RNA sequence: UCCCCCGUGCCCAUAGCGGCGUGGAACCACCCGUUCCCAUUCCGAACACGGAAGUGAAACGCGCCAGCGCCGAUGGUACUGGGCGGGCGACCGCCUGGGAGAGUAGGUCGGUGCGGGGG
RNA sequence: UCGAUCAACGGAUAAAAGUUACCCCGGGGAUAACAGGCUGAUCUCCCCCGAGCGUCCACAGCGGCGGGGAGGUUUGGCACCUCGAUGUCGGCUCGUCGCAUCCUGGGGCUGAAGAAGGUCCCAAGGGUUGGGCUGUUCGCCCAUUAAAGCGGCACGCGAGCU
RNA sequence: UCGCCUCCUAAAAGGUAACGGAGGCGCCCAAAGGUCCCCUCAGGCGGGACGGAAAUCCGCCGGAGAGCGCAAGGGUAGAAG
RNA sequence: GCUGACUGGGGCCUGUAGAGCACUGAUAGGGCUAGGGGGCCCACCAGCCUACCAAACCCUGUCAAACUCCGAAGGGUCCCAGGUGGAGCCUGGGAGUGAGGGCGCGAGCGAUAACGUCCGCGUCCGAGCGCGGGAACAACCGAGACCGCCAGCUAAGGCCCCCAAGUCUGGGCUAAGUGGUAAAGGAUGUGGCGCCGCGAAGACAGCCAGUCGAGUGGCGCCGCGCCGAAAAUGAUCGGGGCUUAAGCCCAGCGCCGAAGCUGCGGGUCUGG
């Protein structure tokens, strides 16, 4: 699968718990953090949830 | 009565509306197509044609479909048409409304009263190749007391009364 | 003054005003409307006042159609009192009005008289109004 | 400092809430006994391996798996398809 | 495998109402009886028993019909998960996902499982 | 298996009401009265609509039914600083500010002949009295007056007095 | 006002406060209980001696609006009547 | 010892938003019309009429927390996947709390008042009155501060001077210092889109209508501004001062800018 590189670029301070949790699932933990992940729907499903905190990019 | 129609693919209706176009559809037992028309030109037409008179739609393949309107949905606020339903006719007999001619004026005048066009038009079964222009009434002795309802009409050839027919059509009633 | 003859319940909750009108939004009777441009509760006293002005204008003349009806009760605690101790007493009644509602309507009149009459009424109403005609308001086939 | 005088209401009651409802859903494994619905009528009618108590309560008669069923005018049935 | 009827389930009104035609050889009914079993707050009406002259009138089965009932898209709206804006407020607006209800076209005078009896 | 309006209904004793301005302690700005604050229903002022009033004639003077605001001086609503204290009416003395102006200066309409009014517009620079009655605020009254304005300053001002 | 039950408020699981809206309970039935077997409502339109506008009788039409001791809701005639 | 939050797919459960009028009520206009009022008019009891009150029924229009023929988005739950997280589950020792506050959204109360009051979901302050923005300012915007740096890149917000960075570019509006905070309502204030009147049947405005020789009027959409606008110590958009802007709308490029992120050194705790 064309893997995903997602990066946290906006602070989740003020946002809902589930969204803050969702970030953990992925494993984004600092800002500017970058991770490459599989393109599986469970991963995507979370990445849509936070779309607005993230720059998303394909690999 | 002709209108340049166009073919709508999947452009957000919003954007079409924004751009002075009027989204819509056309259908009959056989065809079903997303269309759009221009607003001000449609209105120019509809302002007269309405649902009483046929409109011929000119698509971008030169073809010219004979249609009736079946629906004008509109935005309550900014009371404008959001979307037009066009029914393309063929030959099978189709139901529609046909306008009336309120001749003269009623005799209920001394008590201040005023006419009520309860039915400007009536529902009728007709063939697409025998569509009448209008129907002719006879109002004159409509006083402050009595009225008229049912099949008291001058039904021409090609016509079938598709109402009750026992139902009130125009009654003169007291002033405010 | 202008109120129901019965109600299932005597007092009722205030609620809210989402947009639109739901219905009562097209002409239907007379040949000229007065339409709402903003939501509001309109009180019976206002409706009446407007209506009377309409008639007064084209004195005893044409016809009038009052298309909103005050079914909602309007509570208000006694004057000078503090909070609590149940809901207040019913003072009057309102008609909930939302943009694009055709509140009035007229028939058997000149456009000049009509135009004017309505305007007048629009003044008695605590909201902004517009005048209407009889366009593509003919939801038929 | 002139205090306005007030009344009373004759109203301020409701009952204890009673926790009604479906208690297991389609495809939950259940043991015999397990109550499946707490209801005030025949909102659900008892199906295969489903008993119903004096109070309309439906319950598994076997260790199985729950299936629901709408039969239009016949109503809604809860069954336990047994595994074994 | 193909008819028709008799049972008996499933789908849950597109199965229905109302109209109109049909069917008695076989089934089935209505029917003939009220001795016997069994019955009626009074009635052989119903239930039940013994029958087989008569009828398909009733009821049931099969066909046609859209007046009523039922079902019902597509399109477009409303509403809204989530993201963001305007207003002093009532409330309004843009994004991206979901998307009615009414209504228009249209459709419907049912479909099917097992077992029996008859061509 | 029985005896509970143990109903203040998870049920203090088997058994129980008042008063304190003669009052005390411990606390609270967790909670009222004064003041401020938020709010502005009420309150004061101004505006929109033009049924009608005004012999005639919607606005000289007026405005039904209704509609929209301003101000924050009323009575309140809320309980936010203050209960290890923010003295809490009115009077006097001392002022200073606002204009929605009671005189005085301009001015336009007038149902303005003159004189004198009415009404609105601009304008606080200066003025805005002495008494009787009540603690009074305010008010009514006497005699005057060009006039005898209405408010804010913790219902200005008690480490200034009463 | 103080416990208990029904409805709403309650934002389509559950739960959800206020001196919010609005009602009931502190009983009752030896048949109003167990089982077996039967039976089907309210209305409406005719028609019928005393007989109202429903006394009892007949005939059509009537899927449920009747009824189920009592408040409300749910349920229910393929019965809980 | 992988079972957690959260996520993907499947399956149930649901009666709100919206909508609807089939039930329960409310309701406008019309028709038809049981009763009743009342006129015609008599007791032989009938009978005719009613711009009166008024069931059902019909047509056309609506309303509802305690209405629903209908019904989303979402929510709850089980299964199967991902998910090693200062996740989860189990047994025990020690607590503090049991006084909340604001903001947004959804309801109630209230007056569609309150730094009001009561719940619900969320979030922050509380304990983040540490840091940047907002003139100043718990909870609005940005962002979670182990220590050090005379390094670098960004966030919100900014780039005429105070004050870091553009008196940057391209196109419009506006003439009120609007901007620099208010409504009904008024106006030949401006600008931009629309569509009709009707003009050598040459009056649109001006002197006898001829001359006059052309443009005239009327609506409808949209932007910016004007009056409506009066309170009490000295004023003011934070201040200077801004007018083809230093205002407003639309485009774009670059820079500035936090304790956010990088770089470099160090410390500590966990796991390997």
From Swiss-Prot, chain A:
SUPFAM superfamilies documented for this protein: Ribosomal protein L30p/L7e (SSF55129)
GO molecular function, one term: structural constituent of ribosome
GO biological process, one term: translation
Any one cellular-component term (Gene Ontology): cytosolic large ribosomal subunit
Keyword Cytoplasm attributed: no
CDD domains noted in UniProt: Ribosomal_L30
Oligomer and partners: Part of the 50S ribosomal subunit.
NCBIfam families attached to this UniProt entry: rpmD_bact
Protein name: Large ribosomal subunit protein uL30
Organism listed in the record: Thermus thermophilus (strain ATCC 27634 / DSM 579 / HB8)
Gene name in the database record: rpmD
UniProtKB/Swiss-Prot annotation, chain B:
Single GO MF annotation: structural constituent of ribosome
Keyword Ribosomal protein listed: yes
GO annotation, biological process: translation
Keywords: Ribonucleoprotein, Ribosomal protein, RNA-binding, rRNA-binding
Pfam family, any one: Ribosomal_L25p
Cross-referenced Gene3D superfamilies: Ribosomal protein L25, beta domain, Ribosomal Protein L25, Chain P
The keyword Mitochondrion is annotated on this UniProt entry: no
Any Gene Ontology CC annotation: cytosolic large ribosomal subunit
NCBIfam families linked to this entry: bL25_bact_ctc
Family membership: Belongs to the bacterial ribosomal protein bL25 family. CTC subfamily.
Function (record text): This is one of 3 proteins that mediate the attachment of the 5S rRNA onto the large ribosomal subunit.
Assembly with partners or alone: Part of the 50S ribosomal subunit. Contacts the 5S rRNA; has been isolated in a complex with 5S rRNA and uL5, 5S rRNA and DNA binding protein II; 5S rRNA and uL18; 5S rRNA, uL5 and DNA binding protein II.
HAMAP family with a match to the protein in the record: Ribosomal_bL25_CTC (MF_01334)
Protein name: Large ribosomal subunit protein bL25
Organism: Thermus thermophilus (strain ATCC 27634 / DSM 579 / HB8)
Swiss-Prot record, chain C:
Key words, A-Z: Ribonucleoprotein, Ribosomal protein, RNA-binding, rRNA-binding, tRNA-binding
GO molecular function: rRNA binding; structural constituent of ribosome; tRNA binding
Cellular compartments per GO CC: cytosolic large ribosomal subunit
Cross-referenced SUPFAM superfamilies: Ribosomal protein L16p/L10e
Single biological process term from Gene Ontology: translation
Keyword rRNA-binding: yes
Coiled-coil regions, chain positions: none
Pfam families: Ribosomal_L16
Quaternary state and interactors: Part of the 50S ribosomal subunit.
Task of the protein: This protein binds directly to 23S rRNA. Interacts with the A site tRNA.
Record-stated family: Belongs to the universal ribosomal protein uL16 family.
Protein's name in the database: Large ribosomal subunit protein uL16
Natural source organism: Thermus thermophilus (strain ATCC 27634 / DSM 579 / HB8)
Swiss-Prot record, chain D:
Coiled-coil annotated spans: none
GO molecular function: structural constituent of ribosome
Keyword Ribonucleoprotein: yes
A GO CC term assigned to this protein in UniProt: cytosolic large ribosomal subunit
Keywords, in A-Z order: Ribonucleoprotein, Ribosomal protein
Gene Ontology biological process terms, A to Z: translation
Any Pfam family matching the protein: Ribosomal_L27
Chain spans, region Disordered: 1-20
Subunit structure and binding partners: Part of the 50S ribosomal subunit.
PANTHER family noted in UniProt: LARGE RIBOSOMAL SUBUNIT PROTEIN BL27M, RIBOSOMAL PROTEIN L27
Family membership: Belongs to the bacterial ribosomal protein bL27 family.
Known function: Found on the solvent side of the large subunit.
Name the UniProt record assigns to this protein: Large ribosomal subunit protein bL27
Organism (species): Thermus thermophilus (strain ATCC 27634 / DSM 579 / HB8)
């Amino acid at each position: 699968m064309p893997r995903l590189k997602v990066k946290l670029v906006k602070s989740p301070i003020g946002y809902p718990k589930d969204q803050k949790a969702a970030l953990k699932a992925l494993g984004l933990r600092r800002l500017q953090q970058e991770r490459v992940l599989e393109d599986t729907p469970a991963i995507r499903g979370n990445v849509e949830k936070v779309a607005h905190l993230v720059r998303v990019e394909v690999v | 009565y002709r209108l340049k129609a166009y073919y709508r693919e999947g452009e957000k209706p919003s954007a079409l509306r924004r751009a002075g176009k009027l989204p819509g559809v056309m259908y009959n037992r056989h065809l079903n197509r997303k269309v759009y028309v221009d607003l001000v030109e449609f209105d120019k037409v509809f302002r007269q044609a309405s649902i009483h008179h046929v409109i011929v739609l000119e698509l971008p393949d030169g073809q010219s479909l004979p249609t009736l309107v079946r629906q004008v949905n509109l935005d309550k606020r900014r009371r404008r048409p959001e979307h037009v339903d066009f029914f393309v006719l063929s030959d099978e007999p189709v139901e529609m409304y046909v306008p009336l001619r309120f001749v003269g004026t009623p005799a209920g005048v001394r008590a201040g009263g005023v006419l009520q066009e309860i039915h400007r038009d009536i529902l009728v079964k007709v063939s697409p190749r025998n569509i009448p222009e209008f129907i002719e009434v006879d109002v004159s002795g409509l006083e402050i007391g009595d009225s008229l309802h049912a099949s008291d009409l001058k039904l021409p050839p090609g016509v079938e009364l598709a109402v009750s027919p026992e139902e009130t059509i125009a009654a003169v009633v007291p002033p405010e | 003054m202008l109120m129901p003859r019965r109600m299932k319940y005597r007092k009722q909750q205030r609620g809210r005003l989402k947009g639109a009108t739901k219905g009562g939004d097209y002409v239907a009777f007379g040949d000229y409307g007065l339409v709402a441009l903003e939501p509001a509760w309109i009180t019976a006293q206002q409706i009446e006042a407007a209506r009377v002005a309409m008639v007064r204008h084209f004195r005893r003349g044409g016809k009038i159609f009052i298309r909103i009806f005050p079914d909602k009760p309007y509570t208000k605690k006694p004057l000078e009192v503090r909070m609590g101790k149940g809901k207040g007493n019913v003072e009057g009644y309102v008609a909930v009005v939302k943009p694009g509602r055709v509140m009035f309507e007229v028939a058997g009149v000149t456009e000049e008289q009509a135009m004017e009459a309505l305007r007048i009424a629009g003044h008695k109403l605590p909201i902004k109004t517009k005048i209407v005609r009889r366009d593509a308001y003919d939801e038929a086939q | 400092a002139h205090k306005k005088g007030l009344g009373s209401t004759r109203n301020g009651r409701d009952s204890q809430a009673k926790r009604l409802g479906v208690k297991r859903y389609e495809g939950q494994v259940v043991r015999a006994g397990n109550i499946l619905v707490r209801q005030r009528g025949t909102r659900f009618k008892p199906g295969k391996n489903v008993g119903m108590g004096r109070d309309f309560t439906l319950f598994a008669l076997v260790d199985g798996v729950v299936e629901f069923q709408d039969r239009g005018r016949l109503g809604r049935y809860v069954h336990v398809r047994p595994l074994a």
